[PDB]
Design a protein around this nucleic acid. Structure first.
Ligand SMILES: Nc1ncnc2c1ncn2[C@H]1C[C@H](O)[C@@H](COP(=O)(O)OP(=O)(O)OP(=O)(O)O)O1
Ligand SMILES: [Ca+2]
Ligand SMILES: [Ca+2]
Ligand SMILES: [Ca+2]
Ligand SMILES: [Ca+2]
Ligand SMILES: [Ca+2]
Ligand SMILES: [Ca+2]
Ligand SMILES: [Ca+2]
Length: 902
DNA sequence: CGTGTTAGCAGTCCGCG
DNA sequence: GCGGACTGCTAC
């Protein structure tokens, strides 16, 4: 097999590299790497090296890496460009793996771990590590084994060994319900004392050194705790055995009260799953505890126990250890679903970077572009310093706030990357400028045609047509992967609906789920078999279709993020290829395109509907337009339609056969106008929206920019079995809105769009009546606790103190001296509740760490002093009034002359 | 060491015979 | 007590 790297580090003049060899064995080598950098030279000098603008360069081959670095300094002091890859480990990788890396994950040691630390004096701070590590579960991807390190004797208690037999037993038998499929994978190691546990752990670590190290919060707790604990017991050099190159870097963060650390372990690529989740999941969660995320991702129940965690080991060691093991498995289960490790590996090897650099789009792109240019013997420019300047972005139309009965939306595919490719926007393809007319003038095609010769953006930039730029070239490759995965995703989505439709009439028989690939549309034969399957088999098939869809989603949306991140990088001062002309060329072209196509759609629809001068396009944002289809429906008359699906079919046909070709013509013309390199403005029908036929449903509404709701029947070729609500920007979509309120506001919206005012009024009355019976956590607001200290004036609110911060401060006063009441962590999320006047807390609100029950010592009082009235008004009523006034609808029956009657 | 801009709502502070 | 300027937080 072809070789591939595992990790790479620069330490002084040495590259330290862990890799897999031709036989597939792990190896480590140290290399005194001899880097090259480049300087411009005279044209009269014959060379094979050119900068990206075609200017000749000369190679400087250096004796070592410090010399190369010191040369860059001397060049800076002289005032001349020092060209080439200045991050030497990227160059090393590029030299060593001068081919498309084909890697084998089965050879990569992925470690997943978590530790327990009993602490009677509050949170066990990793910087201090003053408490014993009394449990470690470490899963190894190569052994496929959970290695359990269990401390039996501690200052905080001596316990008996943990029982695997009892762990496997159901909770109802008094066991821990450790999932049966990992029971056989556990290797259990008890210890009489901490020192020998840790010694064994280190020696185990040396045998099975992680390449990828993951888990939940390992970066902020587990890794620094282990490191510091081993340091305090055996000394720093022993703690340094955690690095395969015996090298660590310790950096301390301080603010006012608490002190924290993150430890860099050289030769390991740490990918904290919480970080992967936050970057790649496209959620925003009210809490980031593992219990919460596992429940959200896996529908697994919360790992409940009696008493505080500080006493769980002594009171129930059996469960303590079992929960350590389960918490580690849960991360593996989440990754089995979301596949972020797979994505990080794909991305990392594709770019040729340290795997941990997938968190940096800038490092990723710099690496991709460098490798692309190196292949052509081209030399990359030196990074330069730039002041941060603002620049203009996308166009968002101001909608008339109203209900909108029938809506069809249209969307441009992967817009900004498409603009990059259409216009041929790159650092080295800039041809020159033209004098700009006002934007309105291009939108309306009255402005003089920018160029007969070059490809143009309405920001005034001109580009070469007859040569590809590195940026369009490289963005196209990733765009094309993204398209492949999205196709698989939509196919699995469509397959999902075929199953949901078949679950309407399940068959009374015992069979099994069909062996199929959900990434492709079910054939007619498969569809015929599905109609005859049992509910049990269909539901297993639906589960698999949905797992296939999530997998295709992870893969497509994060490739999308990466390419869009190349657009943004052009507007980041740290990017080697930072250029506000290129960034603005993209955004201004986008503004033109959206508004150009608005006019063309309005023109076309007035033509075919035989009217003149009316606004069919009701909204637009960046790359998408929303068309009122009322007059399309009215042109034929509703009476002609048999059912909902009928008119949906009608609009589907209308959009695809009539509108899209008009849109295509429209953009073809715009491309000619800007004299662009390749037409890539592909605007296709997105959603079809309306109320059920014959209902009193209103179909949809806008309240303002970025705030709207639609009852959608078809989305990107997916015909839903049941209508799905597409809600954007409204409180139902916000993580700060209480869970139960999201649920109630969504049902309010469902009723408005599908059923009508009267149905809405029925629900509202019911929810107002039962509001005060809801669980306090379900009705708490949520927020991030940033800059707590900045508003902390003797434990009281300082000037302009935010509501949620006031709540935290109130909490801090109430838990003063509680010793082991959970502290609010800076930057983390809290639940928030308003308090009635005269409460024992001495303020109008309280806040506590989210995903948790508020501590028992103050819980009673919180429940007693909650202001439900304020809570209802602020979280539910005020937003609902916003929705209903926009839709010209009432949530409460208004008074009228009829009230005089019985 | 480090993708981007556009945009609404909640809250504090301030003015307000 | 309701607006306007301001911070803080949260669809493309
Ligand atoms: N995370 C982001 N970073 C930078 N720019 C973004 C981001 N999200 C969106 N944009 C900009 C660039 C996008 O091309 C444009 C439109 O975004 P979006 O509506 O998500 O669809 P898209 O056209 O990029 O892709 P799709 O093919 O999924 O429709 O807005
Ligand atoms: Ca734990
Ligand atoms: Ca789009
Ligand atoms: Ca689309
Ligand atoms: Ca059937
Ligand atoms: Ca869009
Ligand atoms: Ca089309
Ligand atoms: Ca109390």
């Amino acid at each position: 097999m072809k070789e591939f790297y595992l990790t790479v580090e620069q330490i002084g003049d040495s590259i330290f590299e862990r890799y897999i060899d031709s036989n597939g064995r792990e190896r480590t080598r140290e290399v005194e790497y001899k880097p090259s950098l480049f300087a411009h030279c005279p044209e009269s000098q014959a060379t094979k090296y050119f900068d990206i603008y075609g200017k000749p360069c000369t190679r400087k081959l250096f004796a070592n890496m410090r010399d190369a670095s010191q040369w860059i300094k001397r060049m800076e002091d002289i005032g001349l460009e020092a060209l080439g890859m200045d991050d030497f480990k990227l160059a090393y990788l590029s030299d060593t793996y001068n081919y498309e890396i084909k890697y084998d994950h089965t050879k990569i040691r992925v470690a997943n771990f978590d530790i327990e630390v009993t602490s009677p004096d509050g949170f066990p701070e990793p910087s201090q590590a003053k408490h014993p590590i009394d449990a470690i579960t470490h899963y190894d991807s190569i052994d496929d084994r959970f290695y359990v390190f269990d401390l039996l004797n501690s200052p905080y208690g001596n316990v008996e060994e943990w029982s695997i037999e009892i762990a496997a037993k159901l909770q109802e038998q008094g066991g821990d319900e450790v999932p049966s499929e990992i029971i056989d994978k556990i290797i259990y190691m008890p210890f009489d004392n901490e020192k020998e546990l840790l010694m064994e752990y280190l020696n185990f670590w040396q045998q099975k050194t992680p390449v990828i190290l993951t888990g939940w919060n390992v970066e902020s707790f587990a890794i620094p705790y282990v490191y510091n604990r081993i340091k305090n017991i055996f000394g720093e050099s022993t703690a340094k055995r955690l690095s395969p190159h015996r090298k660590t870097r310790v950096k301390v963060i301080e603010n006012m009260y608490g002190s924290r650390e993150i430890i860099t372990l050289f030769g390991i690529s740490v990918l904290d799953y919480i970080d992967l989740y936050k970057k790649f999941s496209f959620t925003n969660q009210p809490s980031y505890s593992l219990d919460y995320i596992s429940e959200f991702e896996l529908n697994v129940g919360k790992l409940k126990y009696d008493g505080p965690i500080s006493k769980l080991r002594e009171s129930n060691h059996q469960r303590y250890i079992s929960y350590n093991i389960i918490a580690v498995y849960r991360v593996l289960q989440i990754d089995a679903k979301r596949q972020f490790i797979n994505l990080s590996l794909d991305m990392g090897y594709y770019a040729k970077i340290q795997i941990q650099s997938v968190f940096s789009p800038i490092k990723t792109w710099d690496a991709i572009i460098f490798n692309s240019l190196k292949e052509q013997n081209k030399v990359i420019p030196q990074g330069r310093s730039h002041p941060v300047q603002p620049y203009p972005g996308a166009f968002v139309k101001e909608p008339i706030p109203n209900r909108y009965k029938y809506v069809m939306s249209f969307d441009l595919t992967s817009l900004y990357p498409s603009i990059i490719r259409q216009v041929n926007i790159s650092p080295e393809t800039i041809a020159g400028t033209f004098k700009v007319a006002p934007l309105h003038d291009y939108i309306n095609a009255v402005a003089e045609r920018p160029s007969d010769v070059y490809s143009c953006s309405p920001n005034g930039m001109m580009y070469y047509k007859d040569r590809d730029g590195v940026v369009p070239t490289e963005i196209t490759k990733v765009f094309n992967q993204r398209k492949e995965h999205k196709g698989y995703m939509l196919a699995a989505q469509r397959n999902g609906e075929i199953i949901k439709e078949a679950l309407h009439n399940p068959n009374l028989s015992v069979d099994e789920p069909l062996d199929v690939d959900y990434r492709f549309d079910f054939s007619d034969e498969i569809k015929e078999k599905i109609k005859k399957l049992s509910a049990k088999s269909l539901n297993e098939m639906l589960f698999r279709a949905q797992r296939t869809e999530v997998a295709g989603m992870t893969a497509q949306i994060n490739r999308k993020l990466l390419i869009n991140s190349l657009y943004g990088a052009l507007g980041n001062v740290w990017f080697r290829y930072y250029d506000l002309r290129n960034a603005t060329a993209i955004t201004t072209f986008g503004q033109m395109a959206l508004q150009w196509i608005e006019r063309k759609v309005n023109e076309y629809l007035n033509e075919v509907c035989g009217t003149e001068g009316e606004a069919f396009v009701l909204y637009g944002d960046t790359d998408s337009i929303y068309v009122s289809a009322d007059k399309i429906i009215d042109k034929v008359g509703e009476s002609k339609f048999r059912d909902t699906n009928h008119w949906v079919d009608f609009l589907d046909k209308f959009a695809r056969e009539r509108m899209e070709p008009a849109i295509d013509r429209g953009f073809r013309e715009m491309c000619e106008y800007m004299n662009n390199k390749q037409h890539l403005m592909f605007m296709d029908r997105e959603a079809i929206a309306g109320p059920p036929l014959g209902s009193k449903g209103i179909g949809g509404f806008w309240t303002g920019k970025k705030r709207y709701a639609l009852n959608v029947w078809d989305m990107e070729g997916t015909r839903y079995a049941e209508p799905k609500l597409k809600i954007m920007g409204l409180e139902t979509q916000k993580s700060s809105t209480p869970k139960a309120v999201q649920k109630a506001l969504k049902e309010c919206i469902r009723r408005m769009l599908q059923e009508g005012e009267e149905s809405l009024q029925e629900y509202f009355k019911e929810f107002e009546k039962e509001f005060r019976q809801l669980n306090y956590i379900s009705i708490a607001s949520v927020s991030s606790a940033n800059n707590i200290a900045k508003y902390d004036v003797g434990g009281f609110p300082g000037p302009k103190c935010p509501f949620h911060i006031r709540g935290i401060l109130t909490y801090n006063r109430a838990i003063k001296g509680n010793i082991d009441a959970p502290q609010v962590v800076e930057g983390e999320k809290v639940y928030v509740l308003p308090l009635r006047e005269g409460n024992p807390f001495g303020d109008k609100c309280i806040a506590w760490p989210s995903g948790t029950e508020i501590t028992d010592l103050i819980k009673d009082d919180v429940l007693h002093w909650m202001d439900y009235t304020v809570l209802l008004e602020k979280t539910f009523i005020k937003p609902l009034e916003g929705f209903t006034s926009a839709a010209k609808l009432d949530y409460e029956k208004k008074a009228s002359l009829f009230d005089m009657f019985d």
